[PDB]
Design a protein around this ligand. Structure first.
Ligand SMILES: O=C(/C=C\c1ccc(O)c(O)c1)O[C@@H]1C[C@](O)(C(=O)O)C[C@@H](O)[C@H]1O
Length: 397
């Protein structure tokens, strides 16, 4: 029976990939309480996040390159176990070098679990149904972003910050074991039946336009999430519950954005679905400007929630659009390399959000850094609008 095994395996990957993201973002979930008991400046936080981002970038790139000669279940279980172990260790350390080393290892382990999902999806599902399943997998990510912050704060009001990560880590370990028991690599182990050149790929302007757009979008999203959580409390006179609700609403909006963008793009030199992407980017920068300027010490909370949801929608739509367009325009025999390059550029964009942004905020203010980010986003949107009727097919032409 294909259906039974498909359902079981997909549920197992859903749970494992949700725990992956939860343990990845636990630091952003608890950061305010940890800063409250251990006095730290913005530079230390930026250093830790940048170290994790760099480690994840290198590990994911190399694992994606060499994934063709490893088993999916073992890699998934190993990665989950290592992430749980480093999360458990994090709950006992109380210094800035140990935190940075532990999160570097966290990124290294988190980079391992990406290729197995694609391998299982390709082995167990039809080639014409990849993206759809990809889509729902992305929703799991958003789910981990939604339940994470608020619960953490709810636990923080009566328990230590160190009593959450540790518990989370334990869960991962247990789930990892269940994952190995519940994941089969191919529909044959159970028993039931189963051009261009590299010099021409990198010499395509559209390949760099897409990469730079993804870089900008990912960096701006990471900046908004972590440093707006801190911005709402440290400068706008709001409490930590509002800071957590802002991120929860951001992820709630991002879920519906990721779900819808595929439908709107599919119903609709250049690409047919560039207008939706440009509109979403414009909405993202407009919402950023409104959030920076309108919110004061005395403002209703459902205005902040609306701003967060709108930004999440306008940020998570373009990510799916970028992925689908990169898959569609890729050379016929170089899809994996193109996906790896675009992911690497998105990861370096996310890396740029940690330390330089925190240093700018430390020197001038949070407002100045957010204004710089919004200015960069507006300039990128204008440039993308200008550079939109160029060749979209990459390769030997
Ligand atoms: O391949 C994909 C994504 C979707 C995809 C694949 C085959 C398809 O046939 C399809 O319709 C859709 O990679 C994802 C997007 C990524 O940014 C990229 O594409 O560069 C890299 C990484 O971030 C991944 O999340």
């Amino acid at each position: 029976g294909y259906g039974y095994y498909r359902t079981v395996i997909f549920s197992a990957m859903f749970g494992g990939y949700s725990l992956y993201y939860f343990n990845r973002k636990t630091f952003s979930f608890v950061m305010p309480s940890l800063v409250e008991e251990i006095p730290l400046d913005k530079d230390d936080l930026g250093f830790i996040t940048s170290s994790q981002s760099a480690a994840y970038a290198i590990s994911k790139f190399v694992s994606g390159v060499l994934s063709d000669q490893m088993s999916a279940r073992w890699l998934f279980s190993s990665g989950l176990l290592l992430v749980g172990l480093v999360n458990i260790f994090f709950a006992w350390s109380s210094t800035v070098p140990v935190f940075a080393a532990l999160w570097f290892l966290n990124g290294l382990a988190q980079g391992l679990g990406w290729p197995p999902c694609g391998k299982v999806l390709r082995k167990w599902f039809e080639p014409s149904q990849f993206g759809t399943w990809w889509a729902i997998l992305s929703t799991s990510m958003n789910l981990a972003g939604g339940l994470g912050p608020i619960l953490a704060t709810i636990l923080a009001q009566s328990y230590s910050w160190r009593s959450t990560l540790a518990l989370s880590g334990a869960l991962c370990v247990v789930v990892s074991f269940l994952c190995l028991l519940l994941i089969h690599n191919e529909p044959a182990d159970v028993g039931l039946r189963n051009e261009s050149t590299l010099q021409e790929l990198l010499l395509s302007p559209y390949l760099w336009v897409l990469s730079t757009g993804y870089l900008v979008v990912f960096g701006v999203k990471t900046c908004c999430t972590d440093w707006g959580q801190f911005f709402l409390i440290q400068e706008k006179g709001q409490s930590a519950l509002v800071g957590s609700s802002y991120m929860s609403a951001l992820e709630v909006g991002g879920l519906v954005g990721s779900i819808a963008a595929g439908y709107l793009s599919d119903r609709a030199y250049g690409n047919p679905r560039h207008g939706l992407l440009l509109f979403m980017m414009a909405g993202m920068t407009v919402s950023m400007y409104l959030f920076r300027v309108t919110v004061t010490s005395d403002s209703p909370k459902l205005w902040i929630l609306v701003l967060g949801a709108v930004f999440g929608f306008s940020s998570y739509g373009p990510i799916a659009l970028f992925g689908v367009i990169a898959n569609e325009s890729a050379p016929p025999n170089l899809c994996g390399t193109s996906h790896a390059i675009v992911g690497l550029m998105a990861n370096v964009g996310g890396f740029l959000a940690g330390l330089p942004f925190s240093t700018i905020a430390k020197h001038y203010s949070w407002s100045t850094a957010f204004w710089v980010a919004e200015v960069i986003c507006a300039a990128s949107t204008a440039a993308f609008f200008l550079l939109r009727n160029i060749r979209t097919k990459m390769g030997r032409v």
